């Protein structure tokens, strides 16, 4: 058992085609897997942003994707215009909204749509809020 036969490091490389994540194989320059036990540990620290950014796609792979609020289909872009083909065929004008999710999520939802299950997403439209001055509070004991 020799050290240099076990060393491994990755910065950037190839991806798996179906899900678009780092590939596998030390001889193929694959990455190390972040398991869900490590995810539990990070949640035990209370570091929400760290795990949120760990499980997300690289910020350098962002792109604009729209979704139809009526049926949940990824709106296509025809001649530069966002359009939901299914709802347009039915003479409807649904709202198209931007989302920021992982590719594997889209693959999973599409495959679930294949089996016949329709998945619909709503979005939060909370009314605006305003800051108000607050009186002071001490909280120390009377000693």
């Amino acid at each position: 058992h020799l050290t240099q036969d076990k060393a491994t490091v990755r910065c950037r490389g190839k991806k798996t085609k179906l899900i678009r994540q780092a590939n596998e194989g030390r001889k193929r320059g694959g990455g190390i897997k972040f398991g869900e036990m490590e995810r539990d540990c990070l949640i035990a620290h209370g570091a929400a942003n760290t795990i949120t950014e760990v499980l997300k796609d690289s910020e350098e792979d962002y792109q604009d994707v729209y979704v139809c609020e009526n049926c949940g289909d990824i709106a296509a872009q025809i001649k530069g215009i966002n359009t939901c083909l299914r709802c347009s065929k039915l003479n409807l004008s649904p709202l198209l909204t931007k989302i920021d999710t992982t590719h594997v999520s889209k693959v999973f939802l599409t495959q679930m749509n294949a089996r016949g299950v329709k998945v619909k997403l709503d979005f939060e439209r909370r009314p605006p809020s305003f800051y108000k001055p607050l009186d002071k509070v001490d909280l120390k004991p009377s000693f």
């Binding site: 058992h1 076990k6 194989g25 030390r26 001889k27």
Partner: protein, 35 residues
Amino acid sequence: TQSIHENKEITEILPDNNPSPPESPEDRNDEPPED
């Protein structure tokens, strides 16, 4: 050893040996029926 607060002692459970990390994978009717 000595005893001071034995009623609050904490016991240690840590295996001495653990498994090394995994390496890269890299009819003649001549048998019993076994019912």
